[PDB]
């Protein structure tokens, strides 16, 4: 269990440094540390991309179903009463419903307060907020799927 907060994620758009919040949810941070250590994402494409609401990825299939954890196939949601979905660039765990978490993830684009009591607020981007704003402008269909490959080159859980 380490907590240097920087994450040296290497994507097709560019290298983004992501600040993990080991302060508020160490469990999901340790699970993604273990998985990105084992390289679950070295060559995974973002799947659901919505303008001004969220950018979702982490699906190896890209079909909105793939995901596997160390605590079973699914693990637990965690919260904090001062981290709320308020702002852009807010990394979080992609989810179906509570008491369940897949390996997928997403970031948001706006103060989205009605989702604070649901999902694990998992990180935030510090270098590369223009990067995630540029990635947020990929054209997608009504099924929210991209045009060409936008794929994670390499993952590093730096710390």
């Amino acid at each position: 269990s380490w907590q240097p907060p920087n994450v040296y994620l290497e994507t097709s758009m560019g290298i983004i440094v992501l600040e993990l919040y080991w302060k508020h949810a160490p469990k999901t941070c340790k699970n993604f540390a273990e998985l990105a250590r084992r390289g679950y994402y070295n060559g995974t494409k973002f799947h659901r991309i919505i303008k001004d609401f969220m950018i979702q990825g982490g699906d190896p299939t890209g079909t909105g179903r793939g995901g596997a954890s160390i605590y079973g196939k699914q693990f637990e949601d965690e919260l904090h009463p001062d981290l709320k979905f308020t702002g852009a660039g807010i990394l979080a765990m992609a989810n179906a419903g509570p008491d369940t978490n897949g390996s997928q993830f997403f970031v948001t684009l706006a103060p989205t307060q009605w989702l604070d009591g649901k999902h694990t607020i998992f990180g935030r981007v510090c270098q590369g907020i223009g990067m995630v704003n540029r990635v947020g402008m990929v054209e997608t269909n009504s099924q929210d799927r991209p045009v060409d490959d936008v794929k994670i080159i390499k993952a590093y859980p730096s710390g």
Partner: peptide
């Protein structure tokens, strides 16, 4: 918006 949607690929130059 009023303007179009600006698209550049992930790696290379500006797509037209």
């Amino acid at each position: 918006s009023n303007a179009l949607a600006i698209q550049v690929d992930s790696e290379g130059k500006i797509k037209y």
